Amino acid sequence: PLMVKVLDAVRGSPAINVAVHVFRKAADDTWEPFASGKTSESGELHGLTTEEEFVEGIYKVELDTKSYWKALGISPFHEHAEVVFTANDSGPRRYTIAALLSPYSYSTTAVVTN
Amino acid sequence: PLMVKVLDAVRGSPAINVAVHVFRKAADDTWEPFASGKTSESGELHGLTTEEEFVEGIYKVELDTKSYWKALGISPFHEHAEVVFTANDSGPRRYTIAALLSPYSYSTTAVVTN
Amino acid sequence: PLMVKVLDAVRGSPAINVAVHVFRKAADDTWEPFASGKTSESGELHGLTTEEEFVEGIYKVELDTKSYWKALGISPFHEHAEVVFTANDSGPRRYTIAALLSPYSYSTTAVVTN
Amino acid sequence: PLMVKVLDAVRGSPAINVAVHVFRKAADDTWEPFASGKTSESGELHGLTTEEEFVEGIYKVELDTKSYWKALGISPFHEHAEVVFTANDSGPRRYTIAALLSPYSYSTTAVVTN
Numbered sequence: 080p081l082m083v084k085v086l087d088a089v090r091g092s093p094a095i096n097v098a099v100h101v102f103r104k105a106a107d108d109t110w111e112p113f114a115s116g117k118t119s120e121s122g123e124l125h126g127l128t129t130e131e132e133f134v135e136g137i138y139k140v141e142l143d144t145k146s147y148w149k150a151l152g153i154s155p156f157h158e159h160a161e162v163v164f165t166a167n168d169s170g171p172r173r174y175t176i177a178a179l180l181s182p183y184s185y186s187t188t189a190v191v192t193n
Numbered sequence: 194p195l196m197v198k199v200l201d202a203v204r205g206s207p208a209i210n211v212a213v214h215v216f217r218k219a220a221d222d223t224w225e226p227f228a229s230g231k232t233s234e235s236g237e238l239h240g241l242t243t244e245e246e247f248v249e250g251i252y253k254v255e256l257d258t259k260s261y262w263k264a265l266g267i268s269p270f271h272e273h274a275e276v277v278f279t280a281n282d283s284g285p286r287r288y289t290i291a292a293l294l295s296p297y298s299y300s301t302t303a304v305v306t307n
Numbered sequence: 308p309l310m311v312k313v314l315d316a317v318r319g320s321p322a323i324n325v326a327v328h329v330f331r332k333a334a335d336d337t338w339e340p341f342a343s344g345k346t347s348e349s350g351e352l353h354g355l356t357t358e359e360e361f362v363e364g365i366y367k368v369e370l371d372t373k374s375y376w377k378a379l380g381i382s383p384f385h386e387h388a389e390v391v392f393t394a395n396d397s398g399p400r401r402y403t404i405a406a407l408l409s410p411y412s413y414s415t416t417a418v419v420t421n
Numbered sequence: 422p423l424m425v426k427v428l429d430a431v432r433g434s435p436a437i438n439v440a441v442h443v444f445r446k447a448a449d450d451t452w453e454p455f456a457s458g459k460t461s462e463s464g465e466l467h468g469l470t471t472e473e474e475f476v477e478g479i480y481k482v483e484l485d486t487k488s489y490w491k492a493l494g495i496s497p498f499h500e501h502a503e504v505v506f507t508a509n510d511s512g513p514r515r516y517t518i519a520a521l522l523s524p525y526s527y528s529t530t531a532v533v534t535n
């Protein structure tokens with residue numbers, strides 16, 4: 080139900096080997112680790128969760144953008160990029176969290192499909 | 194030393210009355226409230242802090258984008274837009290945190306000057 | 308060698324049925340029609356050209372964003388979105404022209420892979 | 422009535438000395454030169470035109486991003502960034518054309534005020 084795709088706006092390439100951590104908000108409002116991985120050679124991260132596990136709730140997807148830019152020898156602004164959203168059952172649904180990275184800027188878009 | 198500017202990509206206008214909360218990471222690794230405010234009719238938020246108060250640290254600027262869109266009748270994807278960065282680690286700088294908002298997407302850029 | 312992918316930042320969806328025109332710059336500096344199509348249900352447009360046809364030169368990819376937003380009943384700013392670039396033989400290469408659309412804003416990124 | 426503002430997403434700075442050419446579509450459907458200039462140290466370009474001269478029409482604002490990046494030692498993807506729009510079709514407006522530049526990506530937003 081949840082995929083992450085990351086692009087590099089400096090090199091015009093997939094952003095490879097980006098660490099991605101997903102958290103789910105707990106009843107005590109803390110962030111509990113939910114799933115994680117690293118983006119592939121295609122800048123994508125699949126298989127984070129399953130339909131059974133990915134119930135409604137508030138999720139945070141954190142991309143370690145600082146480590147990514149450091150590895151490329153480029154001084155970045157952000158510590159990380161965080162994407163926070165509520166998962167909503169309103170029919171069958173797939174979430175793609177897309178991110179476009181520059182050293183002092185990023186954009187993120189949600190592509191939500193049936 | 195810290196200003197926030199927000200635009201609405203649907204209307205082609207400043208994003209007015211966006212609530213902004215700034216936090217600073219404390220010694221115990223928790224997020225301590227640092228300053229807050231709301232964007233003006235120009236989409237800008239000035240006067241959050243001072244050169245004296247704005248010491249080195251890791252800061253989080255949280256824009257309440259969900260409330261912004263809902264007040265305009267739109268159910269957006271994100272809970273908020275969070276911008277996390279180390280500030281002033283090589284001396285005082287002036288930071289403009291810019292954000293561009295769409296219902297299922299946002300971008301953020303930092304302009305940093307000496 | 309050339310693919311186009313378009314996303315809709317208002318609906319968080321592929322941008323479907325977007326008209327795409329590709330032009331190649333001629334010797335007299337005019338834009339000559341090269342290929343065209345409409346994005347699919349996945350927001351993608353494949354099969355525009357072939358390795359044999361897609362030689363080095365200056366190309367323009369035009370997305371009819373105005374007609375797209377009009378069909379959705381949304382007032383847009385731009386007449387269209389234009390992406391202009393030189394194709395460069397520097398090893399085996401695939402170009403993806405990606406675009407993210409809002410009514411008063413768009414971004415475009417080139418993903419260039421081997 | 423027409424201002425251009427450009428930021429550099431690699432440096433987190435204004436994009437200084439970006440050449441800007443404005444064209445207006447003539448009655449014979451060709452692009453007639455309308456105004457030009459370059460961005461200041463603030464990344465802004467003011468004084469392109471006047472309320473009297475800036476009549477209804479279809480305008481193209483072309484930013485020479487390729488020359489900008491090459492002067493900084495970067496071989497970018499795009500030849501330029503072109504922004505094409507109908508202006509003043511329901512009376513005089515003020516237009517800010519904003520652009521955010523990366524070597525293989527750019528975004529542009531319009532802020533339109535009455």
Ligand SMILES: [Mg+2]
Pocket residue numbers: 168
């Ligand atoms: Mg429900």
Ligand SMILES: [Mg+2]
Pocket residue numbers: 282
């Ligand atoms: Mg120190």
Ligand SMILES: [Mg+2]
Pocket residue numbers: 396
């Ligand atoms: Mg060559």
Ligand SMILES: [Mg+2]
Pocket residue numbers: 510
């Ligand atoms: Mg009229």
